[PDB]
């Protein structure tokens, strides 16, 4: 038996990331519904809006984020939300299912049969991919936390942000934090170099994954005849994101050529 206590923070970025990471949300899933791709998609979007609200609260607590121009803050969240949602879905699916099942929430796990329904097959393959890479690379929780912050900071307007210099500084702090997370494992210098290379390749690969997923998100959002619903938060973000995406304004910040 031990007394109740809050965990001990330390003066490191990863320690703060651990305390501000939002708790995993339950979907409040009514599993009595029949299996259908359209119903599943709506359910996922309603969960997604709740996760995005939690992610906005998380971003506000990231050191320096709130010091960027308010427009930069909105833009970064509009450009990165899908990255944040898919990477966290990847983490849950890796930790709970070794990347074999889509773990949206503890009460919403999409199995192989459901993932292979006619109109689920393609999108689920894309959604599950990053989980298989987290599994392959055996990513640690500290590595994951640092990488997830880098994803908030991986896409910017082509013309630059209003607070560009500060943004570059913040981004470099998390690149360095990722290196520290890798190094803490106790590998030698060569292994550290190799692992940093592999994890930054993984970060870069997120852009093509997200392109695959935004194609579904935007088409199901726009074609109202499909009757796939989105909550207000998400609908607003998507409404604002599409014009930037389609005008080619979303610039990816790649580590590698």
């Amino acid at each position: 038996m031990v007394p109740a206590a809050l965990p001990q923070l330390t003066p490191t970025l990863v320690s703060l990331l651990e305390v501000i990471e939002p708790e995993v949300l339950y979907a409040g899933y009514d599993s009595s519904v029949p299996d259908s791709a359209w119903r599943i998609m709506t359910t996922l979007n309603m969960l997604g809006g709740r996760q995005v609200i939690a992610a906005v609260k998380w971003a506000k607590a990231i050191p320096g984020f709130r010091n960027l121009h308010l427009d930069d803050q909105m833009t970064l969240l509009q450009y990165s939300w899908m990255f944040l949602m898919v990477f966290a879905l990847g983490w849950r699916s890796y930790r709970q299912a070794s990347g074999n099942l889509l773990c949206f929430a503890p009460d919403l796990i999409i199995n192989e049969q459901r993932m292979t329904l006619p109109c689920m097959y393609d999108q689920c393959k894309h959604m599950l991919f990053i989980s298989t890479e987290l599994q392959r690379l055996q990513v640690s929780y500290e590595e994951y936390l640092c990488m997830k912050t880098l994803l908030l900071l991986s896409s910017v307007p082509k013309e630059g942000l209003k607070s560009q210099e500060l943004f570059d500084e913040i981004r470099m702090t998390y690149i360095k934090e990722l290196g520290k997370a890798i190094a803490k494992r106790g590998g030698n210098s060569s292994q550290n170099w190799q692992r940093f290379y592999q994890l930054t390749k993984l970060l870069d690969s997120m852009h093509d994954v997200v392109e695959n997923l935004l194609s579904y998100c935007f088409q199901t959002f726009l074609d109202k005849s499909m009757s796939i619903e989105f909550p207000e938060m998400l609908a607003e973000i998507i409404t604002n994101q599409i014009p930037k995406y389609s005008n080619g304004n979303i610039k990816k910040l790649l580590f590698h050529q």
Partner: peptide, 10 residues
Amino acid sequence: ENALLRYLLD
């Protein structure tokens, strides 16, 4: 155009 997200951020 960004009411909800702006509200959360403030």
